[PDB]
Amino acid sequence: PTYPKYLLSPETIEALRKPTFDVWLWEPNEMLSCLEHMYHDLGLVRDFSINPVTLRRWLFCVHDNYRNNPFHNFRHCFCVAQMMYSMVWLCSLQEKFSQTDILILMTAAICHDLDHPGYNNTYQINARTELAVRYNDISPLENHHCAVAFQILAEPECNIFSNIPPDGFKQIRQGMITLILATDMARHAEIMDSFKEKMENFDYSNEEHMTLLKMILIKCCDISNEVRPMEVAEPWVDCLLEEYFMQSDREKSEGLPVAPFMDRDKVTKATAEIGFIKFVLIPMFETVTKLFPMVEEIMLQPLWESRDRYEELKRIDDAMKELQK
Amino acid sequence: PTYPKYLLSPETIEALRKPTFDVWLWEPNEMLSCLEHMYHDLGLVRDFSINPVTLRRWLFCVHDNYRNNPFHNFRHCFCVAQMMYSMVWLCSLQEKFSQTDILILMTAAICHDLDHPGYNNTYQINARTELAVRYNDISPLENHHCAVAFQILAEPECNIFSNIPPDGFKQIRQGMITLILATDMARHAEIMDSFKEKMENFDYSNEEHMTLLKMILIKCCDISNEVRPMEVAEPWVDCLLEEYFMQSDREKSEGLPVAPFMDRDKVTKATAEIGFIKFVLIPMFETVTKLFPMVEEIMLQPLWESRDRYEELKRIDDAMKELQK
Ligand SMILES: C[C@H](Cc1nc(=O)c2cnn(-c3ccccc3Cl)c2[nH]1)C(F)(F)F
Ligand SMILES: C[C@H](Cc1nc(=O)c2cnn(-c3ccccc3Cl)c2[nH]1)C(F)(F)F
Ligand SMILES: [Mg+2]
Ligand SMILES: [Mg+2]
Ligand SMILES: [Zn+2]
Ligand SMILES: [Zn+2]
């Protein structure tokens, strides 16, 4: 007949494997079925004896623990995991990674921003929040996301890892913590350097090489919005700014220091994006391309187009402002 | 948190294995989830590579094809499948049957009453309905349930067998057809005789022996209401009498004969149930017990209690009907 929304159609199931997937077309229920499909499809349910019902509860609990922020919400979570999913396919990651690593990658992606408050680490630290005090100023947000992820997993009804022997649990947990903590942008240069270092003569047998690679992969997915089609990507930039502005406005009010890139009276969307794409996104994806050449066509291409589009957009903006004076 | 109904709680999943499960507490969605869980739990999704999403679309389509009769509806379908599932564990059937047999048993239980009109074969035949004409008075309803079952599986989106090699499909199809046709009570004596004949020296390696055992298994589940707790079983009896009175009514105003056990003025519920329990249910489960001894305490027991309760009800009922005269 005509099946409910939570029963993905075979077209959806197919499109889900590509970075082109339009993440705005679905409601939480549908997004949850997509995430559920990914675990079955990647063979994770199979290889780790994941109780199919526990998987649904775990995903619903994860969903319940994401806040209603303009950017750091459940839909962003879906994007990251969905891009990680596309990359497993595009790069044929199952050929180079064990199932244990694929599991670490996917679960970390889904949990990386759990219970995000909507104010970055700088705000937590300057305002001396409970999180900043709890984590001694060390990546308070990322530490918290990871802690909430394991508190959820510690709930028996949500423990998708219930049938994994303790030695495997330890390995997975250590892997997730490492990846989630690797998403704090304050460590971007640091991580990128370590990767590029190993990249000179990459060894898929070297555990430290693989760890860095996995860190780079989750970082890619986390800030992979601009890799998506222009219509899918643009709205996210507005959501992010909306969140940054809310923070700066609050910092202005409470008398805390304000970061220029988050100040309403200073940031112009186009100009800012150009710098981000040009000096953060493109460079990072170029390094990944050396290992997975198919990335250039599938992900570097859209990044270049985005850079161009925004560079043009700025010219139009400058001329417009130049004319108003 | 507090999950939606379609997410079975771990308590429900546990209960689903026992014949004491309360089949009335659930809405189609929860029942659909239960059936899905059964296919994963028994290892069918795993061993036959059933696409987990197709499994759900299929269950939804099956549901859509059951009518809103008072007895022969989707909830009856859930009962039979659930009793079958319970029997698998009670009798440790996976030690005696292959996964293909289990798949045959489970899928046949679920499909055995598809698109039932609410009027039995005797009516179809006597009224010379389209079905009786189509199937030449040979188990018309059962033949139809079968046909519908395979028209459904013919739809790609609902074909839970799409990944089974053709030889496996044929074996499964043959098996399901045999079990569904075996539910026609007109053949009850025939089948019980043939089974008891083989029972004189049962051979688990003899294919004919196993065929009859599976037919007895599905017949057992099909009419196993009285095995369930009294609170669960009695409402089913009333639901059936509702259809029976609907038929006997229509048969009288059409000039077609009426089966005494369906005649309101002869079918004192208690007297009819006592007979059914004593000469159909008990004898059947009795022979099955000789093969699986544990069946006596778990299913033959409640049948005795049930037979005894209806006998008490009969006394009080006849007394009150004497005043009505
Ligand atoms: C600041 C944004 C661009 C941007 N997009 C991100 O996803 C992101 C993640 N972290 N950061 C970030 C945060 C703080 C400091 C530096 C950066 Cl790079 C980001 N900056 C814009 F240019 F306005 F569009
Ligand atoms: C129809 C009832 C007897 C009876 N009791 C059941 O619990 C039960 C379960 N399934 N069936 C059943 C349903 C459809 C066709 C045949 C049967 Cl046998 C039953 N029939 C009576 F005769 F009125 F007392
Ligand atoms: Mg984060
Ligand atoms: Mg029937
Ligand atoms: Zn993020
Ligand atoms: Zn039936």
Numbering used by the authors:
A (entry chain B), B (entry chain A): 181 to 505
What did the publication describing this PDB structure actually write?
Cyclic nucleotide phosphodiesterases (PDEs) hydrolyze the second messengers cAMP and cGMP, and play crucial roles in many physiological processes. PDE molecules contain an N-terminal regulatory domain and a conserved catalytic domain at the C-terminus. To understand the roles of the invariant glutamine, we mutated Gln453 of PDE9A2 to glutamic acid (PDE9Q453E) and its stabilizing residue Glu406 to alanine, and measured the kinetic parameters of the mutants. In addition, we performed molecular dynamics (MD) simulations on the mutants and determined the crystal structures of PDE9Q453E in complex with the inhibitors 3-isobutyl-1-methylxanthine (IBMX) and (S)-BAY73-6691.
In the Q453E mutant structure, the side chain of Glu453 rotated about 15°. This movement made a distance of 3.8 Å from OE2 of Glu453 to O4 of (S)-BAY73-6691, and 3.2 Å to OE1 of Glu406. The 3.2 Å distance between two electron-rich oxygen atoms may cause energetically unfavored repulsion. A possible explanation may be that Glu406 is protonated, as discussed in the section on MD simulations. In the PDE9Q453E-(S)-BAY73-6691 structure, the conformation and position of (S)-BAY73-6691 to chain A was clearly defined by the electron density maps of (2Fo - Fc) and (Fo - Fc). However, the electron density in chain B had the quality only to reveal the binding location but not the accurate conformation of the inhibitor. In chain A, the pyrazolo-pyrimidine ring of (S)-BAY73-6691 stacked against the phenyl ring of Phe456 and its N5 atom formed a hydrogen bond with OE1 of Glu453. In chain B, (S)-BAY73-6691 formed no hydrogen bond with Glu453, but with Tyr424, although its pyrazolo-pyrimidine ring remained stacked against Phe456. The IC50 value of (S)-BAY73-6691 for the PDE9Q453E mutant was >160 µM, which is >1800 fold to IC50 of 86 nM for the wild type enzyme. However, since the selective PDE9 inhibitor (S)-BAY73-6691 fits tightly to the binding pocket, the Q453E mutation would cause a net loss of the hydrogen bond and thus impact on the binding affinity.
